[PDB]
Design a binder for this molecule. Structure first.
Ligand SMILES: CO/N=C(\C(=O)N[C@@H]1C(=O)N2C(C(=O)O)=C(CSc3nc(=O)c(=O)[nH]n3C)CS[C@H]12)c1csc(N)n1
Length: 265
């Protein structure tokens, strides 16, 4: 009855909703528009922080990177406080994962592929995990503003969730490197009103969000049952009919998250 409840979501909130939950040994896959393209928005900072953990040793996190007030061309709640200080590669990973810091993203992107190769560099990291489908093409902010139907800067709920089962549950990262990424999104401060609000409080919820033009509200999560059994949820939505300034409904992502909880009980 999942598609039945999910179309009603789309109707009530006038939105396009995409959900995919990978099948476990006991639990079938849930999927709604799983293989349609949605815009990454800030969700890409989660597997990008994974690229930077993979590519270098844990020593790299202490390399101080100097950035400016010029380099802030995007919402940057935590990077904006170090206009001259510069921050450790581990602290940027903190910003862009947990505060969705936009400027951290571009430095992290710059550290991964240089000035001009960053987006192609992160996209190749996604390829390196089997995602032959997602692409990044722009840096912040423009990656959040592509027209609907455009393939650039898009992932799919299926693709991004399969990326997430490897990062947190798989062996994409070694145990310690993986330790920090998971810890970062567990500390994440943005997704309170999304997938977290859909599951019971005795579930363990570790998420990273994305929000952008055309009503775009995304949340990608790994959740844990009272019996610890792990589940990867990726919820993506846009409201591309109301134009570029359409309001994201966060309550949508919460709502959809109470249905997959209604079947992962
Ligand atoms: C310039 O780029 N345009 C952006 C943009 O920066 N998007 C990023 C993205 O995905 N971000 C995320 C996040 O990770 O969700 C966030 C975190 S979401 C959030 N959490 C809160 O607690 C809160 O009080 N407010 N908000 C908004 C901010 S925008 C940035 C944007 C936001 S709305 C819109 N039409 N464009």
């Amino acid at each position: 009855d999942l598609a039945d409840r999910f179309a009603e979501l789309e109707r009530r909130y006038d939105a396009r909703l995409g959900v995919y939950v990978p099948a476990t040994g006991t639990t079938a896959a849930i999927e709604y528009r799983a293989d349609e393209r949605f815009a990454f928005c800030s969700t890409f900072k989660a597997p990008l922080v994974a690229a930077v953990l993979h590519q270098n040793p844990l020593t790299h996190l202490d390399k101080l990177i100097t950035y400016t007030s010029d380099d802030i061309r995007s919402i940057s709640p935590v990077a904006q406080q170090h206009v001259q200080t510069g921050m450790t590669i581990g602290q940027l990973c903190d910003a862009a994962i947990r505060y969705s810091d936009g400027t951290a993203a571009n430095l992290l992107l710059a550290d991964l592929g240089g000035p001009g190769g960053g987006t192609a560099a992160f996209t190749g990291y996604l390829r390196s995990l089997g995602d032959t489908v997602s692409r990044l093409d722009a840096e912040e902010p423009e990656l959040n503003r592509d027209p609907p139907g455009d393939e650039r800067d898009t992932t799919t709920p299926h693709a991004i969730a399969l990326v997430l089962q490897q990062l947190v549950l798989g062996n994409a990262l070694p145990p310690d490197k993986r330790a920090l990424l998971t810890d970062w999104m567990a500390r994440n401060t943005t997704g309170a009103k999304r997938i977290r609000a859909g599951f019971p409080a005795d579930w363990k919820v570790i998420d990273k969000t994305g929000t952008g033009d055309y009503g775009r509200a995304n949340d990608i999560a790994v959740v844990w049952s009272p019996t610890g059994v792990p589940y990867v949820v990726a919820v993506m939505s846009d409201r591309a009919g109301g134009g570029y300034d359409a309001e994201p409904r966060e309550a949508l992502l919460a709502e959809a998250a109470t249905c997959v909880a209604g079947v992962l009980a």
